[PDB]
Amino acid sequence: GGRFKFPDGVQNWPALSIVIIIIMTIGGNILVIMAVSMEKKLHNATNYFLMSLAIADMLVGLLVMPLSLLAILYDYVWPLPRYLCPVWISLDVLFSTASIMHLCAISLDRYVAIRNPIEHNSRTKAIMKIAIVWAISIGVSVPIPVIGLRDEEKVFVNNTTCVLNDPNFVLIGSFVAFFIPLTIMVITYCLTIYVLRRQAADLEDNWETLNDNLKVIEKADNAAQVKDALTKMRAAALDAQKAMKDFRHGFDILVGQIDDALKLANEGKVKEAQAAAEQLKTTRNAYIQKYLQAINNERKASKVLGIVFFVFLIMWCPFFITNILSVLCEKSCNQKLMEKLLNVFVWIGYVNSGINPLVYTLFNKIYRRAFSNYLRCN
Ligand SMILES: CN1C[C@H](C(=O)N[C@]2(C)O[C@@]3(O)[C@@H]4CCCN4C(=O)[C@H](Cc4ccccc4)N3C2=O)C=C2c3cccc4[nH]cc(c34)C[C@H]21
Numbered sequence: 309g310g311r312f313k314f315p316d317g318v319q320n321w322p323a324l325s326i327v328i329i330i331i332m333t334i335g336g337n338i339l340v341i342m343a344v345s346m347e348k349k350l351h352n353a354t355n356y357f358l359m360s361l362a363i364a365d366m367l368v369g370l371l372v373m374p375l376s377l378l379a380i381l382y383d384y385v386w387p388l389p390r391y392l393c394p395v396w397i398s399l400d401v402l403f404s405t406a407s408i409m410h411l412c413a414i415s416l417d418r419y420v421a422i423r424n425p426i427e428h429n430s431r432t433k434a435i436m437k438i439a440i441v442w443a444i445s446i447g448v449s450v451p452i453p454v455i456g457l458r459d460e461e462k463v464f465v466n467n468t469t470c471v472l473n474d475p476n477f478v479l480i481g482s483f484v485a486f487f488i489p490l491t492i493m494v495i496t497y498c499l500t501i502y503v504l505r506r507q508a509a510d511l512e513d514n515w516e517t518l519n520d521n522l523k524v525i526e527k528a529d530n531a532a533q534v535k536d537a538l539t540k541m542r543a544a545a546l547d548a549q550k551a552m553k554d555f556r557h558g559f560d561i562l563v564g565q566i567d568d569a570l571k572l573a574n575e576g577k578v579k580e581a582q583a584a585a586e587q588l589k590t591t592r593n594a595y596i597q598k599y600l601q602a603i604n605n606e607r608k609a610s611k612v613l614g615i616v617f618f619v620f621l622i623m624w625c626p627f628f629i630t631n632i633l634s635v636l637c638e639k640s641c642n643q644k645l646m647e648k649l650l651n652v653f654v655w656i657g658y659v660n661s662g663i664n665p666l667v668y669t670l671f672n673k674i675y676r677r678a679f680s681n682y683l684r685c686n
Contacts, residue, residue, distance in 0.1 A: 330377065336662050357417070358668060376658075385469060397452050448485045
């Protein structure tokens with residue numbers, strides 16, 4: 309009666325339990341799609357892009373993970389019809405790349421928004437980005453149907469197991485789908501953290517000059533000395549202002565005290581100006597806390613960026629690196645262990661798709677309360 313498998317030919321039940329992570333991925337992104345849909349605040353362009361990413365990652369857990377689970381259930385013997393594997397593999401390359409490409413764009417956008425925060429029809433650009441991202445991924449995926457259709461031996465080999473059999477594609481696909489985006493995310497990340505640290509140093513330097521000039525005002529006795537030190541603060545305040553409205557307004561109201569004290573410093577006596585430097589001391593200490601919460605925001609952003617980039621490396625690097633070694637190293641490297649590692653590094657890349665939502669909820673207050681409400685509402 310032929311050679312059957314399903315629904316009881318399962319050879320590995322311990323692997324079945326791994327469904328747990330699958331259930332987390334599908335729902336994890338659904339909550340994001342809910343947040344961007346229900347919440348009025350999350351109708352921002354960048355959030356629509358996170359939704360697109362969520363669509364990519366959700367489809368990974370929806371269409372790629374379950375079929376890889378069946379593959380493990382039957383000890384890597386394809387139980388489904390033959391035509392359904394090249395379909396599976398192509399989807400694997402598609403959504404996985406879409407996930408990567410999306411992540412790369414997020415890095416780029418975050419750099420621009422950090423460099424020149426003056427940015428705010430605004431949706432047409434986001435639509436343009438989503439389209440381009442999905443267009444590139446499709447390009448990376450179309451070789452699968454092409455190669456598979458023009459030769460059956462290249463998708464599954466022993467009339468049993470289904471695995472890529474074209475080393476040229478593996479090299480190219482890996483190089484263009486991961487290593488080029490990786491290079492962009494490396495340089496991008498480095499520039500972003502550089503800009504961030506430079507902005508922090510600027511605020512700290514402006515605050516130091518505001519203190520040092522006050523000390524030397526209380527110190528010396530020359531009316532022109534008070535004039536010089538008292539004028540250098542006016543610039544240090546105007547420069548720190550352009551670097552939360554109560555803070556810039558604090559620099560604006562203390563500037564007025566620098567005007568009064570500077571008027572009484574040239575035509576008046578040094579003692580009265582030094583007495584005005586006291587009122588300046590108090591107006592500075594009034595906002596010393598708002599200065600600390602500003603620099604704290606700087607260090608917070610630095611940590612979040614370092615996390616997301618680190619996670620991306622830890623997740624996708626093992627697969628693609630070993631994938632490269634498995635093709636271009638056909639002798640020196642151990643091949644049996646290579647397959648043993650790749651089998652796990654594949655699902656590590658999968659887990660990244662489920663980590664992305666869990667990442668953008670741990671740090672955003674709106675997503676935290678949005679998730680905490682979607683889980684308890686139903
Ligand atoms: C996670 N997903 C997995 C998928 C894949 O390899 N899936 C199979 C089914 O799993 C293997 O790794 C297994 C594990 C152990 C032995 N295996 C192999 O030998 C061959 C790889 C290989 C072929 C020839 C020579 C050396 C190595 N495998 C396979 O075909 C390809 C991906 C990919 C390749 C290229 C560009 C890409 N963009 C996004 C992606 C992607 C997503 C990304």
